[PDB]
Design a protein around this ligand. Structure first.
Ligand SMILES: Nc1ncnc2c1ncn2[C@@H]1O[C@H](COP(=O)(O)OP(=O)(O)OP(=O)(O)O)[C@@H](O)[C@H]1O
Ligand SMILES: [Mg+2]
Lengths: 375, 375
């Protein structure tokens, strides 16, 4: 049974609160070296959502990755949040991965919720040489973005990393979740042959907002997601800010399965376009492009989705991945499913498993409308 | 001391559910001129929102105007819903008015929430000649839209009415809320010289959808709101269906005050554009124009609003109305304020009265960000 007082000491959360959280947002589950773990679905105190506690030789807290705040404007805001210098990295469109070595020597890759992903743990050690880093730094949690076209979670092709890849943006200590300063982190990860997310530079605070403006113009015309700005000694939390095309991308995806994204959502992205038009457009023409790009991202995917279902096709998405065997693919399917995702194996040849995700609500509601159902 | 048993007898709503509604709202007020009345803020049993019960020499239940269902498609939805024939009237973009001659001889214009508008009651009596109609039909509630560019509530130019006119779209019995048949209701209002909404015609159900499509194309090309489809006998409830410019107009106004409406306003309207592109757009040119039209309606109002607030202006809405005197103008404001509206008299020249509406949600949140406040 759950060692509530031990956890109370390791976390700073009173054993009383923890029993209140065992009503709802605190799950006990088997994972790793026959080990019993606790997964904080909801945040609780200093503890972040996605926090996982492993109850082994030592009880290790794998803190959840912290929510990064958003800004819609580069100025005055950057000068209003930061001090002296701003480090500016590339925002990787992928899925958040915390890699840790546990007291059992076992290496584990946590999805944002704190679940171990069988696919992510396999691929993370396949594509990363972690052995020596963890021998020397076993209480540092590698925080990164799994990216690439053959990505079961968020699929964007970053050709320079291959079909599947990884990029570290953080080193955070177990339990305390304290980050290493930016430039030390990059160096340390360099000297173990580990990949850092692209860093555009470190700029004095006066010039930061303009420097970020050019980068974003560059990132947009490349079709990349955007930027994450950081206090070089991480004594100020980060701010994220994204490109217009990044917003058209998400929106276009969202209006392809419009009834699976819980309403706004949609408002939040569009609003980013208002303030960004106010700040980055240097001609009416550009603002015109911005409008055209927004309309088309909305109409055309929704028009094709509707045509599709009209022609008998249910709304689905496929993503072909590398797996070890068909059993492995199946196990990953189950994991997506216990995450509330409609998924099945659609095809399997050698080690390549076609993961099929179904969007039931988009299929149903567009069918009911096409048959004469009333809004 | 309210006569709940009487109101139960006169509405069929159980006495208990009434007292429980009143313990919240449902609200008891004085109106016209020394009568006490019951306003139903939310629906209850068969009672509609905005239903008012007048307690006079007679107990009269001025029923609220029923919510009209909407379709996103003409086909096959019309023929799944209607039978035999389909009557198709213009949907007029203004505000809802219920005119009735209460048992105390006093004529009262009710807005959708069942409040007596001092403006609308004065405007309806100037505009319409109602004395001979109500003399013959005191128990008939005239239901129509007040429309025109110089409108106090929602404003759109309709040349046919100059600055401001009225158009009846329904006749409904007091208490029962039963609607007269379409062709009868129209003949009746004509013989008494009362203005009808344009009725394009009654079509058999197999031709209804293609007919409506043609009306919709003309109405869109002409900047008109859409169509309300009716069973001639009114035995099946109406379906409203709106055009794309109705929507652009709607989303443009929406994003001039983004944080005051919704969040959708946006997903609701945009979803119409999808199915309508599907059913009605015949060339991709048309769909392209639809996308661009939708984009500009979103960015531009949002953009100007941020510029407007960056330059120090509050987010407001002006509208100019024709009033009798300035005494009239200030009564109308006192009226808007007692309904929760942040309005003032911006200006008054020669019977004209600039009514200014403030939207502080939009002003505050847009200023919070321009000050460098985090998303
Ligand atoms: N260079 C980077 N630095 C930090 N985070 C990054 C970087 N590149 C990608 N990310 C990922 O982007 C996330 C923030 O971007 P996004 O808005 O897509 O995530 P989110 O789901 O909104 O996360 P949250 O709201 O919890 O911050 C981070 O949580 C991280 O997973
Ligand atoms: Mg209307």
């Amino acid at each position: 049974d759950i060692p509530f007082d031990l956890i109370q000491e390791r976390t700073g959360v009173p054993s009383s609160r923890l029993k209140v959280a065992f009503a709802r947002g605190s799950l006990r589950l088997l994972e790793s070296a026959g080990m019993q773990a606790l997964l904080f679905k909801k945040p609780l105190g200093d503890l972040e959502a996605g926090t996982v506690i492993y109850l082994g030789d030592e009880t290790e807290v794998i803190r959840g990755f912290p929510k990064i705040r958003r800004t819609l404007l580069l100025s005055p805001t950057i000068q209003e949040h930061f001090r002296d210098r701003v480090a500016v990295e590339e925002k990787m469109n992928g899925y958040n991965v915390r890699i840790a070595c546990l007291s059992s020597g076992e290496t584990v890759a946590l999805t944002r919720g704190g679940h171990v992903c069988p696919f992510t743990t396999r691929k993370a050690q396949e594509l990363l040489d972690l052995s020596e880093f963890f021998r020397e730094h076993p209480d540092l949690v590698i925080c990164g973005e799994m990216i690439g076209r053959d990505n079961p979670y968020v699929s964007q092709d970053y050709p320079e990393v291959g079909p599947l890849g990884f990029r570290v943006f953080d080193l955070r200590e177990k339990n305390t979740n304290r980050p290493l300063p930016v430039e030390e982190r990059r160096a340390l990860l360099d000297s173990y042959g580990l990949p850092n997310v692209r860093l555009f530079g470190v700029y004095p605070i006066e010039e930061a907002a303009s420097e970020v403006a050019d980068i974003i113009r560059a990132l947009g015309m490349a079709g990349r997601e955007g930027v994450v700005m950081k206090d070089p000694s991480m004594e100020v939390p980060p701010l994220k800010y994204t490109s217009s095309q990044a917003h058209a991308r998400e929106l276009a995806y969202a209006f392809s399965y419009p009834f699976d994204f819980g309403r706004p959502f949609f408002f939040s992205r569009v609003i980013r376009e208002g303030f960004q038009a106010y700040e980055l457009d240097e001609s009416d023409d550009e603002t015109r492009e911005r409008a055209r790009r927004l309309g088309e991202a909305i109409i055309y995917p929704m028009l094709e989705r509707i045509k599709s279902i009209s022609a008998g096709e249910a709304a689905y998405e496929d993503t072909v991945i590398d797996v070890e065997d068909r059993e492995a693919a199946e196990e990953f399917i189950r994991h997506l499913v216990r995450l509330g995702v409609s998924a099945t194996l659609a095809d399997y040849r050698d080690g390549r498993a076609t993961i099929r995700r179904f969007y039931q609500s988009t299929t149903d509601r567009i069918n009911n409308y096409l048959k004469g159902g009333l809004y």
